[PDB]
Design a binder for these strands. Structure first.
Ligand SMILES: O=c1[nH]c(NCc2ccc3c(c2)OC(F)(F)O3)nc2c(F)nn(CCO)c12
Ligand SMILES: [Mg+2]
Ligand SMILES: [Mg+2]
Ligand SMILES: [Zn+2]
Ligand SMILES: [Zn+2]
Ligand SMILES: [Zn+2]
Ligand SMILES: [Zn+2]
Length: 1213
DNA sequence: TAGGTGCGCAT
DNA sequence: CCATGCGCACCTA
């Protein structure tokens, strides 16, 4: 429905202009953000006119909900400064929608262009629009196809595929690669002269620019050198007709008078031709000087003078690869040569070097002749010193896409130097199936035509498949940089490129170099670019207009070539290129899991062997049914390899002595329990006898867990009965019908995570396992910082709403690549990684031990296995506790009543709430020591394992406790054990009632996804009818209505089991528990208040607490560690200052009832130097107090900290 | 260079 | 008024 709020506005100032707190002002813009709050519902709209952004405030509620982002609104209200927000705000008594016509492509339906150069926000910090919206715009405009060519990557390929599907637009998959010429010769006119005895005319030119085509030399210098000594010198001035531009007068120390009277070039050129006879020409960047000289020669029909040449730049690059910059000044400085830039100086400088370079070439290598100077070219790190140029690579078919993935992977893994580089030889080998285009003004064809001439461009263009010409608006930065003098030269360059292409019979296309969608989005790019400072060369000049142009805009931009040629290169040739490519699929459709022979049989055998050992050869019918259904779902769907890999990883972890916990719903699987993957038993509560295999199950819902069951002795024999089972259906893990892909996230120890990764490498091979890769983008904090820095540098004053709009526009742009925390991606050995994704190094770190996938794992994890082998501190803490006490972690009673007391109060510990500042003794207990969870425990007083699982679900779920169950419990409507804590509980409760398995599963899925309201009326109706028909209370359905997100029961069971295992040691072995906690979990210690005693710890805690809610993350971590230290002190244990001999590098030591702090506790004692003092103390004592700093590498400062705190006092020096 | 600190991302 | 944890960017002694 039409959205209107107040009086009909008469059917508007630029928001930028309005600054007074005036009233009765019209203002219409675009709504880029919406937010309704509940008081009188208050409306806060951020609206923009692309000039500035203001905030419309309104106090109708149906309209409030109806207004949406992307709308156009006119308010005509009163600007009132007063607000919660300091900025001026608009109080709009009426807001009215307005219809804005979008950009349209006015060309005929069949005569639409294809945009072949598109940059998405996956071009790192270069483009700002998602490929999805660009593809949608192309679809709306009627374009038959569009290309996604990002700068060196293909990370937008999956999103581009989805968008092209949705929009009915063909996607051409390409990349803007940086290609480096594999072989750049050192010697040009190959000849068999002897370098040691030859005569060299080391020459140089001072020019009015860099374009040999469009400018000319003004000074010609040269020195004839022999045996390294000068023989003759030829210096001359050439006068251009035009006065020297101030740029030249400064770059080159030459003024118009300085060359006001000089010989004509024809004469100077003849003089140099005679002077440079039977000699080996020499130059720094000899291509540049030789091109200038040869163009000048040809200007007067003089012979090209093709004597042997040497380019000192290439020779220096080949001889001294260790160097980083090879310009003349840098090289002259390194080799101690002197230079002011006048041609004479340049020449003498090059000569003084060239002698050294030729001597090195003759001695250090076998290059005694001119020809031999080219033998070893393009071999080794040559790619690293070369200057890359832009090329466009498009996949023509699926094999072309695999080749493109290989090229990207090699440019990321083998030829990376500050950018992904492709050597031209590699691009030549894979060219079939690939379309190569000249890219932009940074491509080599445009560079040659604007700086070297038509013949060099027609030779380079021989290698491309099509030639790209962009509108003059894209090239404007060249005219601003003096690279192209004026628009006439630009038009000439573009026309020559069109002709060169027709001459060589190549497709010439107009591309556009799109970097953002609309002309108003340019600002975003600017901000991003500005954020790079001097790192980005684009900051030197102004950015072009690289928005997405329609067909008519492109035809207008190329009208200077004539209507026929423009219509050809814009519409016909682009669509020809599009038609050349067949439909390509960058992402697979099915899941390709690895194949391990005998996996289904192995999983079944393991499960049944463990089940027999635990429940006797005749298995209980309950266990028989469970195992049969689980294994039929697993082995039936080909999911046994997932279970087998998890089993092997956990088995190897257990052999090394580490417990593996789980996250998610793996604990819902009884096959996961029997195979050993998970510790959670999802069976119904029950007893089983460790000795005689007797078992007894309670499927009546009388106990929440087998742990809550009372102690009992075996009827068959005298042994005690082990109680297990938590009533977790497997449908939560395998879904109803068991067709769901199992997902087993395992929390291995932090120490052991690398071992598990390497074990995956062993299981599947080094070439088929890759660390899952993530793409980190510009988020709100970074975008806000970018906008603030931009406004500071440009000295503007943005309104908070604009700033927020500019931050939004620049958000989501790719900023870096990293690794997923625990995700290893496994490729089936019958395929290769390039069937799925390119590869790279995380953050482009070539020293990385693992390679990550180029694509974000979200785009590929449906087609290959992503092993979540995560690291958690709990298995580390439990391993340390086992080390410190010998107790096996799995023998710890998780049903102990005394331990559960810690969840009621601090007394079991032996301390008060008054002393430990906490009602509960769960401080330092994982997932239960937080203030929120501690408050929930205080308000609920759990006393059973089922109630602890409830607490986990309620504390971690969304909308499950704050407004849904805190009240129900406080008012006695339901007990803690009755409210909805975990998603499995909904199904369990409904099944225990009259509801059926399917209905209960559907209800639980709808509630856990927060779709109770989102589902249609008919569905909600069926569910409500069934629940009420079966005596399901009203408060239970009300709860379901308010739940946004719920967590699995197996997840909570695993985390509660770990917490109980740690709490056992906290209660019965306090010193061991505190030692393990501080050694593993605590990283930032004051240690001074800690070493003092309880009073200093309490004072530090009070300081942090009085710092208030506005406290740093470091302060909050310090508060946590200080709370633990205070609790430990209250219980009679104490900390001790570090000791050089006693203290460990990273672990607290136990001595009596005292914890000796490690070196890493000392403020900044560092960790490497920490191990150092450990290494030194075994060589010998630390005598003189100076010896310590000397060997250990202890920084005086730290020595001071130890000096005052008593550590070094021992030292008798 | 090695910590320290944000900050983004993920389970 | 969710917990925990990893990894890279950037700054600084
Ligand atoms: O957002 C998440 N928060 C948490 N908090 C920690 C937590 C600990 C114990 C729990 C628990 C949550 O839940 C439980 F009730 F099951 O027992 N964990 C995850 C995760 F593994 N994946 N995701 C993302 C899926 O949304 C989350
Ligand atoms: Mg020079
Ligand atoms: Mg997973
Ligand atoms: Zn770019
Ligand atoms: Zn480019
Ligand atoms: Zn480009
Ligand atoms: Zn028995």
């Amino acid at each position: 429905i039409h959205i209107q709020l107040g009086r009909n506005i008469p059917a508007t100032t630029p928001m930028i202009s309005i600054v007074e707190e005036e009233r009765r002002v019209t203002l219409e813009g675009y709504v880029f953000d919406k937010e309704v709050r509940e008081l009188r519902k208050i409306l806060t709209l951020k609206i923009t006119d692309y000039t500035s952004s203001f905030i419309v405030k309104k106090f109708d509620e149906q309209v409030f909900d109806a207004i949406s982002v992307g709308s156009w609104l006119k308010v005509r209200g009163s600007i009132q400064e007063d607000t919660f927000v300091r900025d001026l705000v608009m109080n709009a008594q009426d807001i009215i929608e307005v219809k804005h016509t979008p950009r349209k492509d006015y060309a005929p339906e069949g005569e639409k262009r294809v945009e072949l150069h598109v940059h998405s926000n996956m071009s790192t910090m270069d483009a700002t629009n998602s490929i999805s919206d660009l593809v949608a715009q192309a679809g709306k405009w009627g374009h038959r196809a569009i290309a996604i060519t990002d700068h060196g990557g293909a990370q937008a390929f999956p999103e581009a595929h989805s968008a092209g599907k949705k929009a009915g637009v063909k996607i051409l998959y390409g990349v803007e690669a940086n290609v480096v010429d594999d072989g750049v010769p050192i010697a040009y006119n190959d000849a068999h002269e002897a370098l040691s005895e030859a005569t060299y005319v080391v020459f140089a030119v001072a020019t009015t620019g860099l374009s040999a085509v469009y400018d000319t030399i003004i000074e010609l210098a040269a020195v004839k050198m022999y045996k390294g000594n000068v023989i003759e010198s030829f210096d001359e001035f050439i006068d251009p007709g035009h006065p020297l531009s101030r740029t030249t007068v400064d770059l080159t120390g030459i003024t118009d008078g300085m060359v006001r009277g000089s010989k004509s070039e024809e004469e100077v050129l003849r003089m140099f031709l005679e002077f440079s006879k039977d000699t080996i020409l020499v130059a720094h960047n000899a291509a540049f000087d030789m091109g200038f000289l040869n163009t000048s020669y040809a200007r007067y029909g003089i012979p090209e003078a093709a004597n042997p040449v040497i380019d000192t730049l290439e020779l220096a690059r080949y001889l001294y690869p260790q160097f980083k910059r090879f310009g003349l000044g840098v090289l002259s400085k390194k080799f101690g040569v002197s230079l002011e830039h006048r041609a004479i100086y340049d020449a003498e400088a090059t000569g003084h070097l060239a002698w050294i370079f030729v001597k090195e070439a003759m001695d250090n290598h076998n290059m005694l002749y001119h020809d031999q100077l080219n033998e070893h070219i393009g071999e080794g790190d040559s790619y690293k010193r070369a200057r890359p140029f832009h090329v466009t690579i498009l996949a023509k078919n699926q094999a072309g896409l695999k080749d493109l993935f290989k090229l990207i992977s090699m440019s990321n893994v083998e030829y990376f130097e500050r950018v992904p580089r492709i050597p031209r030889s590699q691009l030549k080998k894979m060219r079939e199936n690939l379309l190569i285009g000249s890219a932009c003004d940074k491509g080599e064809i445009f560079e040659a035509m604007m700086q070297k001439g038509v013949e060099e461009a027609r030779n380079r263009a021989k290698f491309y498949d099509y030639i790209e010409v962009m509108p003059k608006a894209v090239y404007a930065p060249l005219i601003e940089q003096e690279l192209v003098k004026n628009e006439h030269d630009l038009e000439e360059i573009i026309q020559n490129l069109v002709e060169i292409g027709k001459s060589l019979d190549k497709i010439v296309v107009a591309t556009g170099n799109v970097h953002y969608l609309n002309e108003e989005d340019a600002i975003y790019r600017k901000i991003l670019i500005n954020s790079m400072g001097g790192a980005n060369p684009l900051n030197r000049h102004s950015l072009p207009d690289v928005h997405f142009r329609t067909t008519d805009e492109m035809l207008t931009a190329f009208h200077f070539l004539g209507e026929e040629t423009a219509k050809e290169i814009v519409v016909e040739n682009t669509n020809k290129i599009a038609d050349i490519c067949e439909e390509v699929i960058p992402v697979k459709d099915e899941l390709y899991t690895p194949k391990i022979p005998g996996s289904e049989d192995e999983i079944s055998e393991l499960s049944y062997t463990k089940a027999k050992q635990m429940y006797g050869d005749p298995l209980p019918e309950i266990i028989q049914k469970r195992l049969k259904k689980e294994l039929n779902s697993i082995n039936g769907n080909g999911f046994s390899v997932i279970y087998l890999i998890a089993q092997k990883l956990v088995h190897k972890s257990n052999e090394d002595g580490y417990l593996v916990g789980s996250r998610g719903s793996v604990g819902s699987s009884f096959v996961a329990t029997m195979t050993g993957i998970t510790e959670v038993n999802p069976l119904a509560p029950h007893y089983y006898c460790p000795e005689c295999q007797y078992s007894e199950f309670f499927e009546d819902g009388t106990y929440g867990s087998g742990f809550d069951m009372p102690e009992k002795q075996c009827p068959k024999c005298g042994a005690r009965l082990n109680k297990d089972g938590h009533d977790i259906p497997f449908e939560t893990f395998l879904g109803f019908h068991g067709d769901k892909v199992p997902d087993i996230d395992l929390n291995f120890s932090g120490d052991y995570q690398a071992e598990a990764h390497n074990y995956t490498k062993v299981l599947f091979g080094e070439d088929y396992v890759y660390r899952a890769g993530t793409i980190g983008t510009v988020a709100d904090k970074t975008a806000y910082g970018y906008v603030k820095g931009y406004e500071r540098d440009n000295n503007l004053q943005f309104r908070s709403a604009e700033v927020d709009r500019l931050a939004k526009g620049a958000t989501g742009v790719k900023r870096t690549t990293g690794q997923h925390p625990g995700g290893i991606i496994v490729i089936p050995d019958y395929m290769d990684v390039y069937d799925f994704t390119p590869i790279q190094y995380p953050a482009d770190d070539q020293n990385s031990e693992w390679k990550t996938t180029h694509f974000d794992f979200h785009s590929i994890h449906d087609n290959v296995l992503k092993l979540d082998i995560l690291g958690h501190d709990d298995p580390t803490v439990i391993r340390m506790l086992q080390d410190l006490s010998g107790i096996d972690p799995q023998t710890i009673p998780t049903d102990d009543p005394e331990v559960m007391r810690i969840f009621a109060g601090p007394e079991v510990l032996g301390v008060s709430q008054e002393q430990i500042y906490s009602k509960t003794g769960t401080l330092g207990i994982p997932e239960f020591g937080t203030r929120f969870v501690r408050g929930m425990l205080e308000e609920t007083h759990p006393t059973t394992f089922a109630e602890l699982l409830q607490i986990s679900g309620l504390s971690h779920g969304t909308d499950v406790w704050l407004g849904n169950a805190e009240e129900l419990i406080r008012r006695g409507d339901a007990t803690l054990a009755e409210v909805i804590g975990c998603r499995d509980d909904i199904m369990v409760y409904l099944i225990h009632a009259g509801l059926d398995s399917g209905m209960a599963f559907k209800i639980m899925e709808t509630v856990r996804k927060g779709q109770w309201n989102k589902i249609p009326d008919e569905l909600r109706e069926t569910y409500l009818s069934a629940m009420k028909e079966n005596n399901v209370p009203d408060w239970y359905i009300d709860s379901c209505s308010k739940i946004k997100y719920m967590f699995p029961k197996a997840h909570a069971a695993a985390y509660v089991l770990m917490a109980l295992r740690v709490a056992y040691f906290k209660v019965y072995f306090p010193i061991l528990y505190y030692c393990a906690y501080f050694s593993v979990r605590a990283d930032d210690f004051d240690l001074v208040s800690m070493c003092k005693g309880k009073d200093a710890v309490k004072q530090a805690m009070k300081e942090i607490t009085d710092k208030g809610l506005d406290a740093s993350v470091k302060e909050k971590n310090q508060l946590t560690v200080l709370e633990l230290a205070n609790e430990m002190l209250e219980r009679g244990f104490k900390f001790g200052m570090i000791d050089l001999y006693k203290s460990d590098a990273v672990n607290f030591v136990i001595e009596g009832d005292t914890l000796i702090a490690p070196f890493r506790a000392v403020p900044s004692l560092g960790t490497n130097v920490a191990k150092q003092i450990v290494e030194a103390r075994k060589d010998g004592p630390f005598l003189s107090k100076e010896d310590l700093a000397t060997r250990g590498k202890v920084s005086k400062t730290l020595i001071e900290y130890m000096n005052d705190n008593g550590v070094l006092k021992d030292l008798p020096d």
